[PDB]
Every structure is written in structure tokens, then in C-alpha cells.
Amino acid sequence: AARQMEALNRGLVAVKTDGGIFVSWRFLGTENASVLFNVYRDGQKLNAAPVKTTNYVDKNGSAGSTYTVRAVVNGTEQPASEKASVWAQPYHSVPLDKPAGGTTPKGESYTYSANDASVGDVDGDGQYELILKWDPSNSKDNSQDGYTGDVLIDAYKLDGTKLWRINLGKNIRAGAHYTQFMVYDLDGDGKAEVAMKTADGTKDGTGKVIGNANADYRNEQGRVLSGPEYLTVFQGSTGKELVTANFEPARGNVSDWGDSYGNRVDRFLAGIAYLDGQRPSLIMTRGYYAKTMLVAYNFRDGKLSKLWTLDSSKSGNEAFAGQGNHNLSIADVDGDGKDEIIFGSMAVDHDGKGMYSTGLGHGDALHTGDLDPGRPGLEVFQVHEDKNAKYGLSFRDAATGKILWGVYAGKDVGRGMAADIDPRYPGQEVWANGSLYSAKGVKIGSGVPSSTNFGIWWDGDLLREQLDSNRIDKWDYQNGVSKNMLTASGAAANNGTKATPTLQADLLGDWREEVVWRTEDSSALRIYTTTIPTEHRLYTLMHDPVYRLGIAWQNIAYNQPPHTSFFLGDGMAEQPKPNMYTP
Ligand SMILES: [Ca+2]
Ligand SMILES: [Ca+2]
Ligand SMILES: [Ca+2]
Ligand SMILES: [Ca+2]
Ligand SMILES: [Ca+2]
Ligand SMILES: [Ca+2]
Ligand SMILES: [Ca+2]
Ligand SMILES: [Ca+2]
Ligand SMILES: [Ca+2]
Ligand SMILES: [Ca+2]
């Protein structure tokens, strides 16, 4: 079946460069291969004949010029795109309303920094808003005791308009593994909503407090290990509470999850999955080191409804404990049109049934995509934390879980990457624990790229570049060394040693991915878009099933980079139009 996807505008962007004005725009999932384009500067056509490629350099444009693009569909020109003004800097700043610092019940002062983001179109005009999580400077890993400041979630238009702020309140602890926020048009009306775990004292964007306003379930460890827990869907445009239910997976006893001090119980993940093959569902998970639960919901016709539960503590589900990562993937792995869940070393079917477990246990990085385009199906590359695991890195059939190849490490392998960086080996290369491999498991040369964090499509070629901290690098495959391509001076990455951008996504312009980094003082987000010309046109990545879902889960726990459902890389085949409709 055709999948619900977003009605997007042209995503037209124009950026001042020394060579003139660089202009790029979207090839929309609704458009055929036969569609061409005309480029207009202030109502004047620039190109003598319609162009195919979705980027263009206007040598004679100026900082005051405005641009439109018109599609040419089966010979006739279509109405103009939305108008685009010229970016006077290589990035676009979104000014932020930095939350005031505070002081914990124990007298610890904290301040706020801009942290993980997501995107959704909350008003339905085809341009994304940014949904930003603020992090207090005393946020905590689950292993660490201590009180934390409130978690704040804001919505911003790209012009800097602050639409709202939600304060999750004292009963939601701050830290990577706590709030996992989903931004998506769940009900299919054309407008995104925001869904996340909430509690008594959560304040919506209109200033209305949920539940028992004054209840305080913080224990002396600064953890919230008792009291009600809620799941709320908020209106994207206003941050208003739409509906709130009791949260599942429910806590039960803290000790059910594998410790009594409050670590394992509060290990959350979340996602958007097309469980019915047509429309989105919401996935909320709890646990992964031992007891593990996953619960699916719909938000449709104004109602939240629970669809299924997978609980490893149920007789027959024992194998589905102890396998999850600090991240997950979502993809149709078995070809039935419906999305499955890649939950670290295990997988869960669209109906909530456990599919397989590799038994290799918990890890910190995960990549699900078409890694080996010579092998039908998707593949999963994963690293493993247990020093005694049979493999420190595993490369597997996404659908069956069969190990295609793996390498024993005998130690915690905390990072792993997948990206087509070497055109001499068909498909995506993978690297971890000091070695680079082909998709077939053949070690390539010696050493690895200088980062093992994100892959990003940045330059004009079909290979994928690397992102880490405030840097984009490109692998010189002939010489076996990384070389810097961009250092975003004045921009900072997030999450300490994880060094993740606020967001990486194809948010605007052509198929290359934008990066959103905070400034060092979090007074702004900067949106960088490439001005490197390309000869290639590809469907906007937000119209790919798997990529779009990757953007939805990018924020969760230990942020991972997004992948396409198809092999995008050197030697790739031309892609057909995505099977989609818009609301
Ligand atoms: Ca919008
Ligand atoms: Ca909606
Ligand atoms: Ca499927
Ligand atoms: Ca299935
Ligand atoms: Ca870990
Ligand atoms: Ca494959
Ligand atoms: Ca390759
Ligand atoms: Ca490239
Ligand atoms: Ca782009
Ligand atoms: Ca995160």
C-alpha cells in the first residue's frame, strides 16, 4: 500500500557564495522522473532550457534577490514555488529563547543548553518546524544519582518564532535515557503532533499542568521511581495537551528490571512505525539490559489506543530480554509493507511478536539499511558492549537475524559506523574497533576513518561523508585517511563525548543533508546547508520510508545517524518514485 507521508513545499533555498548564489530544492516524492525545472530570479527565468538537477548556481544574483522554481510536468509549467530569499551566511540562524537557570532542592545551580531536536510540520505549510529539547547542566546518566533541573521542549519556526514551551516538570528526570520525544503527524490531518512520557506536574504549552500539579515523586537520589506515569500527545502548533493516558510499559516494581537503585527501569526508547503498512503508529519501549517491554499505540480520530505489548517477562518471551541498544531502527525488513522494529540484537514484528534474537546482547550503535546491495533484503550492523560476546561487531540479515559475518573483539566496542566511503567495494563499508570492512566482512587496509559517529551526505558525490563534533570529514579511500571538509566555527555539538549535532536531516534544498548545531552559548541554532554542486537528483530523503523514520528517532537515547530504505551510494540504481500519498 501507499504510505502516508508529508505534503512538503519546494524546500527552495538560496545561499550566497563567492561564485554567486547557490540555489537548491526538493525533488518531491509525488513527482515523476520526467519532471524538469525552471529557475526564476525575481520573476525572471535564468535557464534557457528546463533543468533536471535540483541545484543551480546563479552567477549574477545578489543578497537582495529572491528566487522561485517552477516544475515542468509533461510539457507544461506549473505555478511558482514559495519564494526564497538569499542567506547572507553559509548557515541560517534560528534565535532561541534560552531558559533561565535554576537551583535544585540541594542548592546546586544549573543552566540550560540546546540539545537534541526533531522536526515536524506543525501548521501544514510544507516547511518543517524544529522541536528542541533543552538540557540542564546537571542532567544525569541512569547510573548516577542526583537531582536534575526540569526538561523543557520548545517549538520554533525557521524564522525564529517560538511557538511554545512544554515544561516536563519535577517528576521527569533529565538525561539521555529519560525523555524520548516523537514528532509526527500521527492522525494524518497534515499537521505534526508531539508525543512523550509525562508526569504529574508536566506543564503544557498553554500553561496547563497535567495530573496532580504539586505531587513530588522525586526520591532522595533525585530519581522518580514511584507515582503515576503518563503518555501525552500534544498539539504541534500550540503544545496543548490533546490526550493523556497512563504510560505503558508501566513501571511495576523497580527491581523487576534488574536493579533496585533505579537504573534499568528507566531505560526508554521510542519510535514511529507503520505497523499497518499505511499509517504511522507510536512505539514506546522500556528496559533493555534485562526485562524489556515494547508497546504500540495509535493516535487517530482524536483518540489514543493501545495496539499491542511485547513483554520479555511473559512465558515464551525470555529470549527478548537483554538484547536492546541505547537506540533502535524501524524498517520493513520482511517485505510485507509493514514496519518491523530492530531493537539492538533482537527484532519485533509489526504485530508485536518477537522475531529473533542474535543473543549478542546490548550495544551502543546500530545501523539498519541496505548495507549490502548485492544481497536481497536489509542488513543490520551492530556493535556489542559485553567483552565476552561472541562478536564485538555483527553484520546480519535484518529479517531473519542470521549472522552474515561477525568479528570477536574480547572488549566493549562502543562505536560502529556504516557508510559507503570506498567505491572499490560495492555497498556500504562498516567500521568498529579499529578496523574498516566491506559489506562482506573483508578488512580494508589498516585503520579507520577519524570518527565513528554519524554519516552524512554533504558533498556532490554519492559516497557518504562523516560527521562528528562540529566537523564534516571526507574519507580519502585511496590513501586511507580522513580529511576535514567543514569545521563549523562557533557551533558546538551536544551530549559530551557522544558529540552529536542538534539534528542532521535533509530539511530543505536538494537531497544532501542539513546539519543543525547550537551556538556555544545556545543563543541560536544554526542550520548549515551544502553549497557544493552535485550532478545528482534524488527524491527528498524525508519521502523515503526508512530515512523519515530515522529522523523521528534521531533524538532517542544515544542518537544514531539516519539511513535510506534503498542503497544510496556509488553504483546505485536509479530509484523509482516512492509509494506514498499525502493528507
Ligand atoms: Ca510549518
Ligand atoms: Ca496531526
Ligand atoms: Ca514488514
Ligand atoms: Ca511483518
Ligand atoms: Ca551501553
Ligand atoms: Ca541488501
Ligand atoms: Ca563501498
Ligand atoms: Ca558524498
Ligand atoms: Ca537538503
Ligand atoms: Ca539523545
Cα of 124 from ligand 1 centre, angstroms: 5
Q: Omega before 249 cis (within 30°)?
A: yes
Q: Is 351 annotated as a binding residue?
A: no
Cα distance between residue 524 and residue 63, in whole Å = 22
Q: Which residues of 538-572 are buried (b: 16+ CB within 10 A; e: fewer)?
A: bbbbbbbbbbbbbbbbbbbbbbbbbbbbbbbbbeb
Q: How far is the CA of 9 from the centre of ligand 1 (A)?
A: 9
Asked if 528 and 478 count as a contact pair (C-beta separation under 8 A), the reply is: no
- Nearest-Å Rg of the Cα atoms of the chain is 23
Nearest to 267 by CA among 294, 241, 240: 294
* 501 CA distance to ligand 10 middle (Å): 10
Residue 420 CA to ligand 7 center (angstroms) comes to 4
User: 350: annotated binding-site residue?
Assistant: yes
Residue with cell 509489526: 350
466 CA distance to ligand 7 middle (Å): 14
Distance between CA atoms of residues 380 and 365, nearest Å: 11
End-to-end CA distance of the chain: 15
Distance (Å, rounded) from C-alpha 105 to C-alpha 101? Answer: 14
Which ligand is nearest the CA of 537, by number?
A: 9
Distance 479 CA to ligand 2 centre (A): 49
Is residue 125 a known part of a binding site?
yes
Backbone angles phi, psi at 540, to 5 degrees: -50, 135
Q: Are 441 and 395 in contact (CB under 8 A)?
A: yes
Nearest ligand to the CA atom of 503: 10
Annotated binding-site residue? 340: yes
d(CA 415, CA 327): 12
Strand order across the 329-331 sheet: 329-331, 340-343, 346-348, 354-357
Please tell me whether 121 is known to bind a ligand: yes
Ligand 5 centre distance from Cα of residue 325 (Å):
7
The ligand placed nearest to the CA atom of residue 566 is 6
Residues with CB under 5 A from ligand 6 (ion): 370, 372, 375
> Is 349 annotated for ligand binding?
yes
Q: Is 248 assigned to a binding site? A: no
Nearest ligand, CA 364 = 5
Q: Are 29 and 543 within 8 A, CB to CB?
A: yes
User: Cα(116) to centroid of ligand 10, in Å?
Assistant: 6
Inter-residue contact 539 to 28 (CB < 8 Å): yes
- Domain spanning 1-89: CATH superfamily: Immunoglobulins (2.60.40.10)
Task: Compute the distance from residue 402 Cα to the ligand 6 centre, in Å.
Answer: 13
115 belongs to an annotated ligand binding site: yes
DSSP 431-492: EETTEEE-TTS-B-SSB--S--SEEE--SSSSS-EEEETTEEEEEETTTTEEEEEEE-TTEE
Distance (Å, whole) CA 483 – CA 473: 5
CATH 2.60.40.10 location in the chain: 1-89
* CB neighbour list of residue 583: distance below 8 Å, 6 or more residues apart: 4, 7, 185, 188, 189, 190
The residue assigned the cell 551492530 is 382
Residue 461 marked ligand-binding: yes
Contact 268, 177 (CB under 8 A): yes
Q: Give backbone dihedrals phi and psi of 69, rounded to 5 degrees, phi first.
A: -125, 140
Q: Which ligand is nearest to the CA of 234?
A: 2
Q: How far is the CA of 339 from the centre of ligand 5 (A)?
A: 25
